[PDB]
């Protein structure tokens with residue numbers, strides 16, 4: 714996702730974490746504001762453009778070598794690659810936070826976890842085809858862009874009504890309501906099935922496989938004849954919106970559950 718998507722995920726997570734988890738995270742981050750997670754949720758996307766952070770570019774993706782829309786699937790050993798991926802990064806940075814939460818690596822580990830759990834939920838962050846749809850040029854509200862970009866940015870910004878941190882906070886409030894009492898309330902109790910702090914690869918792969926199913930059902934199901942030739946701000950956006958909204962919600966809810974496990978101690 715772009716910045717709005719990441720900040721939205723982070724604000725949702727803030728709404729679900731336990732107080733002890735909040736305190737654990739605020740201490741690591743040096744920030745006890747009511748935007749403590751949201752304020753770091755875009756860091757990985759700036760860091761990757763620097764010489765020191767170049768190595769972390771592949772950590773935003775798992776390039777699933779499936780055959781969408783006919784068939785979708787993610788396989789860790791097949792898809793991660795030698796340079797690492799979102800799944801291997803979740804394992805690395807989660808383990809840093811379990812083993813050395815007071816060390817010098819915890820800060821960036823936590824910022825990575827907050828970001829990357831968001832990215833795992835962007836279906837085209839879990840898809841090899843045309844570099845996750847970057848190579849699929851499209852038209853969106855008259856502008857030339859690509860399919861990856863509209864999932865990261867154009868569509869969630871349109872739905873949220875903007876791109877800023879405050880717009881993200883308002884959007885997060887909306888989606889949080891959907892989880893607690895609204896649209897998602899009767900299904901969110903299954904959204905952490907399979908979660909296991911002792912197995913970050915298994916856990917994150919469940920989430921990645923879930924998001925990747927939407928590459929076939931939603932992202933590419935209209936077929937490339939339609940996608941290449943139709944302005945995607947109309948009916949395409951209409952069908953995409955419930956999907957990216959539920960995935961952003963899932964990302965925040967799952968992020969919060971994961972942070973709770975990271976911070977947890979038996980009293």
Ligand SMILES: *[C@@H]1O[C@H](CO)[C@@H](O)[C@H](O)[C@H]1NC(C)=O
Nearest residue numbers: 797801802805806809818821
């Ligand atoms: C774990 O994270 C550290 C710090 O970013 C990095 O140096 C290291 O290569 C990572 N290890 C793996 C296996 O990804």
Ligand SMILES: *[C@@H]1O[C@H](CO)[C@@H](O)[C@H](O)[C@H]1NC(C)=O
Nearest residue numbers: 843848849850937938939941
């Ligand atoms: C759509 O564009 C992609 C990317 O350039 C191409 O691989 C695909 O064949 C195109 N399909 C049609 C129908 O133009």
Ligand code: NA
Nearest residue numbers: 810811812813
């Ligand atoms: Na521990």
Ligand SMILES: [Zn+2]
Nearest residue numbers: 714715719832
């Ligand atoms: Zn992103």
Ligand SMILES: [Zn+2]
Nearest residue numbers: 714838861865
């Ligand atoms: Zn992206």
Ligand SMILES: [Zn+2]
Nearest residue numbers: 714758773832
């Ligand atoms: Zn990213």
